[PDB]
Design a protein around this ligand. Structure first.
Ligand SMILES: Nc1ccn([C@@H]2O[C@H](COS(=O)(=O)NC(=O)[C@@H](N)CC(=O)O)[C@@H](O)[C@H]2O)c(=O)n1
Ligand SMILES: Nc1ccn([C@@H]2O[C@H](COS(=O)(=O)NC(=O)[C@@H](N)CC(=O)O)[C@@H](O)[C@H]2O)c(=O)n1
Lengths: 580, 574
């Protein structure tokens, strides 16, 4: 068997007196009165080795430097004084033998602090990526990757128990989730390409046409986007699909799955069921379709209070939303929130102060005439600051919701734990304020609400979709919908989305043909697994939970990708780079 | 909750008297005696629905057609006589309600017969792939896909219990001009730059050992743009794993126990442990192949040193004479077929003779009588057998008679059953300049290190192949962890410093920061599943594979893109 008798970090006082064989890295060396103390490290943590001048191990111990790899043999003994910061801190290994398995030069940044329970100083992330195989030696990074393992295994255990079949779907496939495709040139016929899948969407629906009833996959997705907002060129989804389901069936299975994952991998109990908010409810109350429920400060509609007001900017607005903050803001901070508001298309931010009887600052003058109704509507107390955005309903909600989020940081609100929620009853179409156009919030295979089918031709903007988003702590961690299984309806919805019969055949003809062979009712969802793991670990970026990620420009400092290829190779593909 | 109360195929006599709600596809319809029989299908199998004339569902049941999707409601009853070919065969459902959820076109081929336990006529595979979502309705295809699920879950269970960490590695990585051709991905923001899809996770998994994770695995997709002949797909799946502080023995032992766990859990088959082991040299000598089929015997025997004084010059002067004893007197037709198999494998010919009770007859029988007692003790041949001989260079004679041995198995109608695994070990590190076999990180055998510069062709590697029924299903090695030894192997290969950096620079630098001893392996998961299912191609164990030519008839890929999509990438077709 193995030479190793134990993981180094697993030794305890119950092993005192045993002879052990250990293998690991030298976390740190210190010399004292002729003794050589080596902190030996493996994935279970540190244990102290002691090399005595009279031991045969001593000559070898004198050569050793940090990050060298050694095999050590000796007797577990109690330390005269224990180190309470270490799990092995009561014991040490009295070395009888020591062998160097590998030498090492000094690393470009330290990896030893976290194994001692000490705080790690911030290193340059471009350097950590360039030497990612050293960065991954740190305890925090190994914890992240081992949590990732435990989450996926929990997912397999639960979905296997629920009868889901794991199916691996293609990577070299047909050239659809609202991004650009990554292409792969076909070598034998220049001008031909594969595309990497933006998601397995069409394949998992075909697996329902095939009668497998329920599917899942830990799927890699590839999307060529502006990597703004911590995007990686490829990323991981828990993808799943079910047959003969309504929305509620998908929502309940996912809730139970999430509670299982959090229980088994984090030791956290998630109360069930998750809260549910409709799209309109979410934006009315929070000004966001990804509400952060870790704090209050809900938005209130006060437009109907100003229909007789001399303040034309309020009186003409479709909506005036208000938010009461429990603090008297400085003029600098107010201007900061005003800038946030203006960055979200608002015409501006109004403000005032609540005092014992009257109001002070900003627009207080125009607030005095409606004081009684306003205080009942906002629940504001003396010392608060009231903020207002006036305008069209979606802008006013969205602008003051972003002010709300920013203000939680300014006020230092303690936001704790994991607050999941479903957002449901999305409209089928979203209005692009900029491009003056209708676009789909979810992909084109999302089923409209069956009660709304006659509105597809009469009034498309009132049409509800059978779609849903899963939100965690103000972050979208999942999204899905019930699908269209009638080929007539899917073409009808394609026509509505501005897709003629020619484009339908060229992009989706194979899938529309599949719908004519008896497609069952089906629906599904996909989680953003990297996003979820980042939240579960409190990481600032999904790069902390991916073993070998790209940097922010989608480049790989570790390997040098992306890079040129030999001119010979590029000519074999029958392509050339166009001259600027 | 769900509308259905049960999977259609899960109903048994224990459900008699319950009212059920079922959803599925119409497998077939038959009218007999005024009753309408509908075989309702879902993934657990078929159940008979019966519509009686008085029933509200009677008119609906008469109009439904194959592959329509329906919801049925009724009472579970015993059949008057059971159909034992169905798991639900003791029961049927008396319909009270029947609702059509989707109509269906007549499929281009039948998918109904397997679910009744009947043989299925072979359909054009190109037609099956074009309508793959329909092909996957067949019972056979769903069993393959569900077996694949059970194998992967069993791998996760076992390796998780043994302390392995699953780690996902990059799909967009560095293109290298190293050997097999990469599939490329253009980098939009800087035309002329490309990512490559990974040929394997090799460098990432070794770096994970340098990172101290101790033991890793991944169900990994590999992409290799090479010749697709011999049932290859442009991408395929490996079970990929790596371990620290191991010797060859530690890797083989782990993989043996893992494989036995997989077969027990996913197939209900017991694999005796340990697996047999043969060195590469023993495998070549006894079977003429580095992937021996152990499902039958008929071992090759070296008889060269028997004819060093025989008059038969072609035997007497050959470097090697290999012999094989077949337990059947063959026809002159059969011998000439084996002879052509030998010549097709670079042999000069195939000598033969029959073994009689007192001596030999036919072919080269005359030159065999002087050495009869020794020839028979070496071949263990009995009267009635037929001796085949190939004389020539050692590797050629072995390889040719090994292929003769395989073709002979079919001629004799040998029963080849079950699952026969073995390890092939102690491969040579190199082969003639000099070149490595798989990748250049494989460790030399420690006791052969001084021969690296003196006698390189005799240096053994710490490399191993896993073979099942004559097929390579896995390969790996102990890796080099000493950078000075890795540079030493590169100097032996003539691979300069500028070429090392351009091809492995980031990994060779990683070795300078303390790499532990480590080693690993990868299984060909598709290949293993095809063997586990008796499928003739890995296409049968992949949900949506390419055809034999590498194209996808289902979606039409690879396909052109609009010129604007390609111009945005800064590339053009020449
Ligand atoms: N660049 C990114 C993008 C996304 N994601 C995460 O993928 C989820 C689903 O993606 S999705 O595009 O919203 N819809 C789909 O892919 C559907 N096919 C799923 C279905 O309808 O069943 C999002 O909710 C994010 O959490 C992430 O992490 N990084
Ligand atoms: N076109 C194919 C090719 C292969 N394979 C299967 O991958 C195994 C390993 O691949 S390998 O190429 O022999 N080496 C490696 O990839 C090393 N990184 C493994 C290691 O050293 O740990 C083969 O033994 C086949 O069973 C398959 O299925 N289809």
């Amino acid at each position: 068997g193995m030479r190793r008798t134990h993981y180094a970090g697993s030794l305890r006082e119950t092993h005192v007196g045993e002879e052990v064989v250990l293998e690991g890295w030298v976390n740190r060396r210190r010399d004292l009165g002729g003794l050589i103390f080596l902190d030996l490290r493996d994935r279970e943590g540190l244990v102290q080795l002691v090399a005595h001048p009279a031991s045969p191990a001593y000559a070898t111990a004198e050569r050793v430097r940090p990050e060298w790899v050694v095999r050590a043999k000796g007797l577990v003994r109690l330390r005269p004084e224990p180190n309470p910061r270490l799990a092995t801190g009561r014991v040490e290994v009295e070395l009888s033998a020591l062998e160097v398995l590998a030498e090492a030069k000094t690393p470009p940044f330290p990896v030893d602090a976290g194994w001692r329970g000490e705080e790690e100083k911030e290193a340059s992330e471009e350097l950590r990526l360039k030497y990612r195989y050293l960065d991954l030696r740190r305890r925090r990074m190994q914890e992240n990757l081992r949590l990732r393992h435990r989450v996926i295994k929990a997912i397999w255990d639960f979905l296997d128990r629920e009868g889901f079949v794991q199916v691996e779907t293609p990577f070299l496939t047909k050239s659809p989730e609202g991004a650009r495709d990554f292409l792969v040139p076909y070598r034998h016929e220049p001008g031909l390409f594969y595309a990497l899948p933006q998601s397995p969407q069409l394949f998992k629906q075909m697996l329902m046409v095939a009668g497998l009833d329920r599917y899942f996959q830990i799927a890699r997705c590839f999307r060529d986007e502006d990597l703004r907002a911590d995007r990686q060129p490829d990323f991981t989804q828990l993808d799943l699909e079910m047959s003969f389901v309504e929305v509620e069936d998908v929502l309940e299975l996912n809730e139970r799955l999430m509670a299982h994952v959090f229980r088994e991998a984090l030791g956290v109990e998630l109360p069930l069921p998750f809260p549910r908010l409709s799209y309109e409810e979410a934006m009315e109350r929070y000004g966001s379709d990804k509400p952060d429920l870790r704090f209050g400060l809900e938005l209130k509609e006060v437009g109907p209070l100003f229909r007789q007001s001399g303040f034309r900017v309020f009186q003409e607005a479709e909506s005036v939303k208000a938010l009461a903050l429990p603090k008297a803001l400085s003029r600098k901070e107010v201007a900061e929130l005003e800038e946030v508001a203006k960055r979200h298309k608002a015409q501006g931010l109004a403000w005032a102060r609540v005092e014992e009887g009257g109001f002070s600052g900003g627009v207080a003058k125009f607030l005095e005439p409606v004081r009684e109704a306003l205080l009942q509507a906002t629940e504001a107390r003396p010392g608060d600051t009231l903020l207002f955005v006036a305008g069209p309903r979606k802008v006013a909600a969205t602008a003051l919701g972003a002010v709300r989020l920013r203000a939680a940081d300014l006020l230092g609100l303690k936001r704790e734990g994991f607050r999941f929620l479903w957002v449901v009853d999305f409209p089928l179409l979203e209005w692009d304020e900029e491009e003056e156009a209708w676009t789909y919030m979810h992909h084109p295979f999302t089923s409209p609400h069956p009660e709304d089918l006659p509105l597809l031709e009469k009034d498309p903007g009132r049409v509800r979709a059978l779609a849903y988003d899963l939100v965690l702590n103000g972050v979208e961690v999942g999204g899905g919908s019930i699908r269209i299984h009638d080929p007539r309806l899917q073409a009808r919805v394609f026509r509505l989305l501005g897709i003629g019969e020619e484009e339908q055949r060229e992009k989706f003809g194979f899938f529309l043909e599949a719908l004519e062979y008896g497609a069952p009712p089906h629906g599904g969802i996909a989680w953003g697994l990297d996003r979820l793991l980042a939240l579960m670990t409190g990481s600032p970026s999904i790069r902390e939970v991916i073993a070998f990620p790209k940097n922010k420009e989608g480049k790989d400092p570790l390997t040098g990708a992306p890079s040129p290829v030999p001119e010979e190779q590029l000519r074999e593909l029958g392509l050339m780079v166009v001259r600027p």
